[PDB]
Specification:
The protein has a three-stranded antiparallel β-sheet with strand order 1-2-3. The longest helix is centred in the middle third of the chain and has 20 residues. Helix 3 packs across helix 5 and helix 4 runs parallel beside helix 7. The protein contains ten helices and three strands. A hairpin with a 2-residue loop joins strand 2 and strand 3. With 164 residues, the chain is mainly alpha-helical. It has a single domain, classed as Lysozyme, CATH 1.10.530. The termini are close together. Bound molecules: ligand V1A, chloride ion (3 copies) and potassium ion. Potassium ion (K) binds next to loops. Keywords: Antimicrobial, Bacteriolytic enzyme, Cytolysis, Glycosidase, Host cell lysis by virus, Host cytoplasm, Hydrolase, Viral release from host cell. It comes from Enterobacteria phage T4. It holds the Pfam family Phage_lysozyme.
């Protein structure tokens, strides 16, 4: 297991434009296209992202290319954020993947708002951090995924992704 395999489990793979858990047009391995309700706007974002006229369908190689860019962008967002970088630097590699996962799903600004959870993680108070992380819209709206990510923070193991 690693961050790519973990997010591939959590996000799935679909080669046509679909709506994510929030209703937003998405493609590939969780590549958010736009929050606009216009499918035409989403198709324009897709063509710009891929570099060709796609009409809403991409190949697996193209999906994996966007996915690698998106994982890279999540890490870069962590490293450039004054609240996320110290927590990231303090963590082992397994728990770093859990933080990347959250940033991939909700963005740098959203995760940086988990001020109290981040402090408990930096303090390595793993059970307390896990309890605090679940007191969130994130957990309530995507509880099965949040439980996997939280277990990863709590234990520093890949146990929540093993049977998947
Ligand atoms: S985050 C944060 N809050 C307190 C003041 C408890 N800290 O020492 C951190 C970990 C920098
Ligand atoms: Cl709490
Ligand atoms: Cl709550
Ligand atoms: Cl879920
Ligand atoms: K998804």
């Amino acid at each position: 297991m690693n961050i790519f395999e973990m997010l591939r489990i959590d996000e799935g793979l679909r080669l046509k434009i679909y709506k994510d858990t929030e209703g937003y047009y998405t493609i590939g391995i969780g590549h958010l296209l736009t929050k606009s309700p216009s499918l035409n706007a989403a198709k324009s974002e897709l063509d710009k992202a891929i570099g060709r006229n796609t009409n809403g369908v991409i190949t697996k190689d193209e999906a994996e290319k966007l996915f690698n860019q998106d994982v890279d962008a999540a890490v870069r967002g962590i490293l450039r954020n004054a609240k996320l970088k110290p927590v990231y630097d303090s963590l082992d590699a397994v728990r770093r993947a859990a933080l990347i996962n959250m940033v991939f799903q909700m963005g740098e600004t959203g995760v940086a708002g988990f001020t109290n959870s981040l402090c408990m993680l930096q303090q390595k108070r793993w059970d307390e951090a896990a309890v605090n992380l679940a007191k969130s819209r994130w957990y309530n709206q995507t509880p099965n995924r949040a439980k996997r990510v939280i277990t990863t923070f709590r234990t520093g193991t890949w146990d929540a992704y093993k049977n998947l």
